Amino acid sequence: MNTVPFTSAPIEVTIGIDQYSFNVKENQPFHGIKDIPIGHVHVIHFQHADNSSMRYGYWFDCRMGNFYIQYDPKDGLYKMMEERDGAKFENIVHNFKERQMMVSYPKIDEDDTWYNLTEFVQMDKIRKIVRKDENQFSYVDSSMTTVQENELSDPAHSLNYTVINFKSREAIRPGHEMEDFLDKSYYLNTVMLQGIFKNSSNYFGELQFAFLNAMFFGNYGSSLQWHAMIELICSSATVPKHMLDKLDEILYYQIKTLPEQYSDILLNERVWNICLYSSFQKNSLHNTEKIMENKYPELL
């Protein structure tokens, strides 16, 4: 189990770690988060008490370095940094643990939620969507726009998700116009899976990461990407049976984890109704359809 220490908490802030969150008061004696489960990526995220504008945070994997959080009063946010001196870091953490100045990552033993939300997400792929190669961790916030968004303005601060566009030459073989527009299997299996993602694990990893950035930061370009990747599978007549079964699981845990009071904005009525009721895979998402109908019957 690993630790992200905090130098201090000089401004009042709600801190998130994965699906957990807690309130820290201005200059409260808080020095970080311990007992963080090894084996998964994580995200530690922030919303200032004073300006709920800009949720921001950092994706990281404790196996890739020792990371801490330090408030920057000039740029006005909590910044993640890597400590290269290993013995310095251990001694800092040990002192904060001895003084019980750290919150414990509060995982219930029965609880596989975070695994199920990040099963296919890998730090190496995150770092290719969020390009900032001098750091082992990746910053994301509410306002960052995606490559596709910028095509329709700062490139270095973009989310480089794979562009999906159903009315594009990439998606539509010359001479197969109707066939490929009404059944997207070509685009799913040959262009995206075989060509771009190489395998369905990488496809699912980007889909999960998009969802997580949508949920945790309200990042609108990410929500667009999550729905696009779902629709591309649902609108393909020919999908590997194992991909469909796993998609149902992935979506099931995403819908389960979404805050109930955010469903109005984070969920696209057209995509879900089409996916669950009109598409080729309308009968292939039993768990997801059951939870959607019992938890958000209004949307449908």
């Binding site: 009315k167 594009s168 030459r169 539509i172 116009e177 109707m178 527009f181």
Partner: protein, 237 residues
Amino acid sequence: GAMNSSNYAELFNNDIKLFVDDTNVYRVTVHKTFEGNVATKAINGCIFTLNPKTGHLFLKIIHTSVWAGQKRLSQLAKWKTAEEVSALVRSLPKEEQPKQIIVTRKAMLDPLEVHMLDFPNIAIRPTELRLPFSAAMSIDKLSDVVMKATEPQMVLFNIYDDWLDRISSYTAFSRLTLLLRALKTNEESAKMILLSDPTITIKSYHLWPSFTDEQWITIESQMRDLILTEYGRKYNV
């Protein structure tokens, strides 16, 4: 965006544009089978592609053979339309290709958009106008060439005859839409109006009779009377 009353004079500016109407592409007669079920029998159809400024109508005849062994024909009809329009554009010299294509029904948008991906600079637009182009098959010479076709065929017609020698495109289009609206609302009366006078003939190379300017005014008046009449007969006013 959408073409409507507010921007109606854009049709007659100097940017090339085509109206595309798919109403008459897939035509059927519905009938009873020996077993008392219901079956359709397709008949030949046409795509109505009109340049509104010049009157040039590219009438692509759709021969019933194109439907053989196909399913979901109403949906195929839209993609077929889009394929044939895209082929037409590609066949035109660059300086003759349209800058905009306006579809009379919104369900042509995605099919045409997808077939014209190769032409990103051609705008595909809907319209809020309820244009009467379905009535093109009430024009006897167009109906006849559609029904006689034994194979796919493109027939080339000027739908304004020689009217542009004497009137503007705006007036020519307004006459045409009034004639077609009349034929659509009461084809029998409309045709009686156009032919009542045996002395006014249709030239071999034309579609409509050779009316003088004065006679066109009488004709136009009679067609408006018809459209109000039927509007009363239909609504009891």
